[PDB]
């Protein structure tokens, strides 16, 4: 294939591989080291991506996309990189079948648009009409802990967050800002309100729909979209890997369930099991985050794909 593009894809892919381990709630720690020997140890992809040194320009670019994604929204920094590397890895198969990368780019673009179109449908709304006492706030707390992972310190953060004024109609609350990511998450939940079933359920459903859509698009772009879907299904796989069991079998089981009209099922990492409903266990993601992850990943992957060669300046 086109050697430059392959080298790039490889670099991005290796960085993704490095970051795959630090995904989910039971993500392993990375050991960051300064030029002076000072050591920081963390499983936060934001920190890893931000502080780390990387020489290859493709990986650098991917990191740039990740950072921007981390700026626009506090969460999803690892997910974007992992998904980008995934998209490139799945693209590789198509490049090997002699499919020109602009076609792949187009397919990925269509897949992304469709996904972003489907997200709001596959989500579930929350009550923005009021901050009323009855169980509107208590359900957010669950997401807060879901982000954190404490009998006290519960009410306090919510009240401290409620202090800050604003409704906006379209329900779009504005706030002038582990604790950080929690505040970020809550903010993101309000800023546009829909919740999404975490633990990979969204990826799985999105993939299942995208294949059908791919069958409509029909061309090589069908293969590109189907690749996008396969690339989306890599996150549930990893989460299942952190859960412990043989990833593929679980991926298949999950897929099975999504076929059923079980519609959403997910992998409970901490529980180390697959669960029929991830809302029940309050495994939730803000759509604000997921959409940003999709955008960032697809932009990164197409960007890598759109580069033909390297020239000395």
Partner 1 sequence: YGKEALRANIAAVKAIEEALKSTYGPRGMDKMLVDSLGDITITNDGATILDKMDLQHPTGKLLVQIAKGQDEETADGTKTAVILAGELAKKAEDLLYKEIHPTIIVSGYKKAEEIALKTIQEIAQPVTINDTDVLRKVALTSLGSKAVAGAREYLADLVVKAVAQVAELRGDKWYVDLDNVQIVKKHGGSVNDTQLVYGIVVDKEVVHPGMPKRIENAKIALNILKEKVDKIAATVVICDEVAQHYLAKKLAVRRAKKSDLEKLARATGAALVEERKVGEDKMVFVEGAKNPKSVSILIRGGLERVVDETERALRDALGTVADVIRDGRAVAGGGAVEIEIAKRLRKYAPQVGGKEQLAIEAYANAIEGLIMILAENAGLDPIDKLMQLRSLHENETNKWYGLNLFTGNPEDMWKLGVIEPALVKMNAVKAATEAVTLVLRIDDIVAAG
Residues that bind partner 1 (CB under 8 A): 4, 18, 21-22, 26, 28-35, 37, 39-41, 48, 51-53, 57, 60-61, 64-65, 68, 71-72, 97-103, 106, 218-220, 222-223, 242, 244, 246, 248-249, 251-253, 255-256, 259, 303, 306-313
**Which of 98, 151 has the CB closer to partner 1?**
98
**Which of 155, 166 has the CB closer to partner 1?**
166
Residues 6+ apart with CB under 8 A from 278: 197, 198, 199, 201, 264, 265, 266, 268, 284
Q: Which of 68, 214, 194 is nearest to 119 (CA)?
A: 194
**Which of 144, 289 has the CB closer to partner 1?**
289
Cβ 83 vs Cβ 160: under 8 Å: no
**Which of 99, 201 has the CB closer to partner 1?**
99
| Plot region of 44 (φ>0 → left; ψ -120 to 50 → alpha; else → beta) | beta
For 160-191, letters b (16+ CB in 10 Å) and e give: ebeeeeeeeeebebeeeeeeeebbbbbbbbbb
| DSSP summary character for residue 242 | H
We find the least distance from the C-beta atom of residue 91 to partner 1, in angstroms, to be 13
**Which of 24, 193 has the CB closer to partner 1?**
24
We find the least distance from the C-beta atom of residue 108 to partner 1, in angstroms, to be 14
Cβ 157 vs Cβ 252: under 8 Å: no
We find the least distance from the C-beta atom of residue 9 to partner 1, in angstroms, to be 13
Q: Which of 87, 101, 167 is nearest to 130 (CA)?
A: 167
We find the least distance from the C-beta atom of residue 123 to partner 1, in angstroms, to be 21
Cβ 107 vs Cβ 221: under 8 Å: yes
**Which of 103, 118 has the CB closer to partner 1?**
103
Given CA atoms 166, 178, 282, 23 in this order, what sign does their dihedral have?
positive
We find the least distance from the C-beta atom of residue 57 to partner 1, in angstroms, to be 5
**Which of 102, 180 has the CB closer to partner 1?**
102
We find the least distance from the C-beta atom of residue 241 to partner 1, in angstroms, to be 9
We find the least distance from the C-beta atom of residue 155 to partner 1, in angstroms, to be 31
């Amino acid at each position: 294939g086109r050697d430059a593009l392959r080298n790039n894809i490889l670099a991005a892919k290796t960085l993704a591989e490095m970051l795959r381990s630090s995904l989910g709630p039971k993500g392993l720690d990375k050991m960051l080291i300064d030029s002076f020997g000072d050591v920081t140890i963390t499983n936060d992809g934001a920190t890893i991506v931000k502080d780390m040194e990387i020489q290859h320009p493709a990986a650098k670019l991917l990191v740039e996309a990740a950072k921007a994604q981390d700026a626009e929204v506090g969460d999803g920094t690892t997910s974007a990189v992992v998904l980008a590397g995934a998209l490139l890895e799945k693209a590789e198969s198509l490049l090997d079948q002699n499919i020109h990368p602009t076609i792949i780019i187009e397919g990925y673009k269509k897949a992304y648009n469709k996904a972003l179109e489907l997200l709001p449908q596959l989500g579930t709304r929350i009550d923005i009409k009021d901050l009323n006492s009855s169980v509107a706030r208590d359900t957010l707390r669950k997401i807060a802990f879901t982000t954190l992972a404490l009998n006290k310190i519960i009410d306090m953060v919510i009240d401290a967050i409620v202090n800050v004024a604003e409704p906006l109609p379209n329900g779009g609350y504005n706030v002038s800002l582990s604790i950080n990511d929690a505040l970020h998450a809550l903010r993101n939940i309000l800023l546009e309100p829909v919740i999404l079933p975490g633990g990979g359920a969204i990826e799985l459903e999105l993939a299942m729909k995208l294949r059908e859509y791919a069958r409509s698009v029909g061309g090589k772009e069908q293969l590109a979209i189907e690749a996008f879907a396969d690339a989306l299904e890599e996150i549930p796989l990893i989460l299942a890997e952190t859960a412990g069991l043989e990833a593929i079998s679980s991926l298949m089981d999950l897929r099975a369930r999504h076929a059923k009209g079980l519609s959403n099922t997910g992998v409970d990492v901490i529980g180390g099991k697959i669960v029929d409903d991830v809302y029940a266990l309050n495994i939730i993601e803000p759509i604000r985050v997921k959409s940003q992850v999709l955008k960032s990943a697809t932009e990164a992957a197409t960007a890598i794909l759109k580069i033909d060669d390297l020239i000395a300046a």
